[PDB]
């Protein structure tokens, strides 16, 4: 029953805490927590490849893609491993994150421990935007806050 946690920080006011739980090996992962300081609405939410914070969130590299697929939404088969879709901030700017995903893992080749969770400035178009960038990042915009994913239990 592996457990992980991530403290999202950035230059601006967006900040949060996101926990992860995987009861069985290679089974679904629960992702739950809270982000704040966001504009109301949808915000891209991804696991990026590197747990490098030397030059801010930019050092995290691209979306975690150990299978070298194209960007999509979490429900699509063609997707990055770290494509977690969008989180929703209310009028107050608080996104209550509740997600269940079977592509990310806390072990094996799809392990995200030691990589970087990142919340984005705008919505992820899930790869349906009809342009090249949509097949890469989903046009979610700049990185508002991020953090290395660490072992919790």
């Amino acid at each position: 029953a592996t457990k992980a946690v991530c403290v999202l920080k950035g230059d601006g006011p967006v900040q949060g805490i996101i926990n992860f739980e995987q009861k069985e090996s290679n089974g679904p992962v629960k992702v739950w927590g809270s982000i704040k300081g966001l504009t109301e609405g949808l915000h891209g939410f991804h696991v990026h490849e590197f747990g490098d914070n030397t030059a801010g969130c930019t050092s995290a590299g691209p979306h975690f893609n150990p299978l070298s697929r194209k960007h999509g939404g979490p429900k699509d088969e063609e997707r990055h491993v770290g494509d977690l879709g969008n989180v929703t901030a209310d009028k107050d700017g608080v996104a209550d994150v509740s997600i269940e995903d079977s592509v990310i893992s806390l072990s094996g080749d799809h392990c995200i421990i030691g990589r970087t969770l990142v919340v984005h400035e705008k919505a992820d178009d899930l790869g349906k935007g009809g342009n090249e960038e949509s097949t890469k990042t989903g046009n979610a915009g700049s990185r508002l806050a991020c953090g290395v994913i660490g072992i919790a239990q």
Partner: nanobody
Amino acid sequence: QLQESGGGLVQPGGSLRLSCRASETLFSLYAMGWYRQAPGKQPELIATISGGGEGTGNYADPVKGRFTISRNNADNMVFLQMNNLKPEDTAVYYCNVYGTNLAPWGQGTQVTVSS
């Protein structure tokens, strides 16, 4: 829930401004797109607007540089300004959310380009 208007017949090179009134619950996700749909085909996403403030727009390749998407937060409305229209643009246009579960489609508005 979603109500589009502003379409019609326009000669090649002309222009149009589609409008859509969306419910406040759908608008408040601040991820709105215009899709175009040809007969028998699936609706493709054509323009997106998301983020705070006045919003930020992104465009699919066949319309980039000719179409602009915008929104009015107070009126909960979305707009597609289409310029330099071509026959390939002929389609029924719909406005919906994106980046999440699609809401029930509206009636859309037909756009025909021909001289």
